Structure formats: structure tokens, C-alpha cells
Amino acid sequence: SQKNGIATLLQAEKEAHEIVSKARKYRQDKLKQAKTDAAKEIDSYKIQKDKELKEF
Amino acid sequence: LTPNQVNDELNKMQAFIRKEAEEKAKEIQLKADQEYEIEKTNIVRNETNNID
Amino acid sequence: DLSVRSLHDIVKPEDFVLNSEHLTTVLVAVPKSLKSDFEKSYETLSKNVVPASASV
């Protein structure tokens, strides 16, 4: 039963590693995302201030 | 070994393997939300002062 | 003699691991008098032992 008990628990670990690997992926996505959603706030704030200069 | 001792460890260990998988992925993606905010705020506030 | 010997002419992924994330393999040199005592006790010696892995 050597090759059934070791084989099954090890496969469990191969699944366990894959879930951890998805959450690492998730975290990389959130870094790229962060630069992206900060870019959309600057250039809308930029033109708001440019609005009130043009009003002036 | 006997047949019960063999199943007793198999159920207990595979529980742990799952518990440790869940615990590590959940902590890493918990940190992913936090870290997103730090960086989005940081990039904005530095460059908003530059706009001002 | 087992006090400086560990196998390395042969290497199999079901007798040796350490490139998992959860699993390792530790080799125990047990005296031949103590041998039957090792098969009975090994599971119980620590928690979370892979069932039926003890073989010579």
C-alpha cells in the first residue's frame, strides 16, 4: 500500500500548490491593476483643475 | 499496521494538506487587496501634488 | 554501514521527496532487533505520517 498512500497524499499537495499559485497570480493582477486605476484618477483631476483655469 | 490505523492517519493528514493550502492562498489574496490600495493611493497622492 | 550511508545510486519519487511543498522524506536506520518494533510504532511516533510508507 506504499504506492497508494504516498501517491494520493502527494497528488493532494500538487492541488494545494496550484490553489496557492492561483492566489499568487491574483496578487500580481492586483499590482498591475493598481497602477491602472491610479492613472484613471489623475487625468480626470487634471482636467477638473484645467476647467477652473479656463473659467478664470 | 492494521487497517484502522492506516485510514486514521490518511483522513487526518489530508485534512491538514487542505487546511494549509487554504490558509496560504487565502492569506496571499487577503494581502493582494491591501497592497492594491497602498499602491493606487501612493501613485495618486504623489502625482496629485505635482498637478496642484 | 548506516551511519554514513544514504541511497543515491537510486532515486524514485515514491521513496524520496523534498521537492513538494508539504511532504519530506526522513530515513530512519533502525537495528535489525528493533525492526518489527519500528513498523508497529512509526505511525504513532509523530503526527501526520503517510500511511503504509515504512518499507526496507
From Swiss-Prot, chain A:
Tagged with keyword Glycoprotein: no
Principal place of residence: membrane
GO CC annotations on file: fungal-type vacuole membrane; Golgi membrane; proton-transporting V-type ATPase complex; vacuolar proton-transporting V-type ATPase complex; vacuolar proton-transporting V-type ATPase, V1 domain
Protein localization: Vacuole membrane
An example Gene Ontology molecular-function term: ATP hydrolysis activity
Membrane-spanning ranges: none
Keywords linked to the UniProt accession: Acetylation, Hydrogen ion transport, Ion transport, Membrane, Transport, Vacuole
Biological process per Gene Ontology, one example term: Golgi lumen acidification
N-acetylserine modification, residue list: 1
Top-level taxon: Eukaryota
Disulfide bonds: none
Subunit-level organization: V-ATPase is a heteromultimeric enzyme composed of a peripheral catalytic V1 complex (components A to H) attached to an integral membrane V0 proton pore complex (components: a, c, c', c'', d, e, f and VOA1).
More about this protein: Present with 2280 molecules/cell in log phase SD medium.
Protein name (Swiss-Prot/TrEMBL): V-type proton ATPase subunit G
Lineage: Eukaryota, Fungi, Dikarya, Ascomycota, Saccharomycotina
Curated annotation (Swiss-Prot), chain B:
Localization: Vacuole membrane
Residue ranges, annotated region (Interaction with VMA5): 1-13
Residue span of region Interaction with VMA10: 12-31
Effect of residue 2 to A: Increases ATPase activity 1.4-fold
Function: Subunit of the V1 complex of vacuolar(H+)-ATPase (V-ATPase), a multisubunit enzyme composed of a peripheral complex (V1) that hydrolyzes ATP and a membrane integral complex (V0) that translocates protons. V-ATPase is responsible for acidifying and maintaining the pH of intracellular compartments.
Other information: Present with 16134 molecules/cell in log phase SD medium.
Subunit structure comment from the entry: Homodimer. V-ATPase is a heteromultimeric enzyme composed of a peripheral catalytic V1 complex (components A to H) attached to an integral membrane V0 proton pore complex (components: a, c, c', c'', d, e, f and VOA1). Interacts with VMA5; the interaction is direct. Interacts with VMA10; the interaction is direct. Interacts with RAV1 and RAV2 components of the RAVE complex, which are essential for the stability and assembly of V-ATPase.
Family: Belongs to the V-ATPase E subunit family.
Name of the protein this chain belongs to: V-type proton ATPase subunit E
Highest classification ranks of the organism: Eukaryota, Fungi, Dikarya, Ascomycota, Saccharomycotina
Name of the coding gene: VMA4
Portion of the full sequence shown: 8 to 59 of 233
UniProtKB/Swiss-Prot annotation, chain C:
Subcellular location: Vacuole membrane
Signal peptide start-end: none
Superkingdom field: Eukaryota
Family: Belongs to the V-ATPase C subunit family.
Purpose: Subunit of the V1 complex of vacuolar(H+)-ATPase (V-ATPase), a multisubunit enzyme composed of a peripheral complex (V1) that hydrolyzes ATP and a membrane integral complex (V0) that translocates protons. V-ATPase is responsible for acidifying and maintaining the pH of intracellular compartments. Subunit C is necessary for the assembly of the catalytic sector of the enzyme and is likely to have a specific function in its catalytic activity. Reversibly leaves the enzyme after glucose depletion, causing the catalytic subcomplex V1 to detach from the V0 section.
Assembly description: V-ATPase is a heteromultimeric enzyme composed of a peripheral catalytic V1 complex (components A to H) attached to an integral membrane V0 proton pore complex (components: a, c, c', c'', d, e, f and VOA1). Interacts directly with VMA4.
Other facts: Present with 21114 molecules/cell in log phase SD medium.
Name recorded for this polypeptide: V-type proton ATPase subunit C
Organism: Saccharomyces cerevisiae (strain ATCC 204508 / S288c)
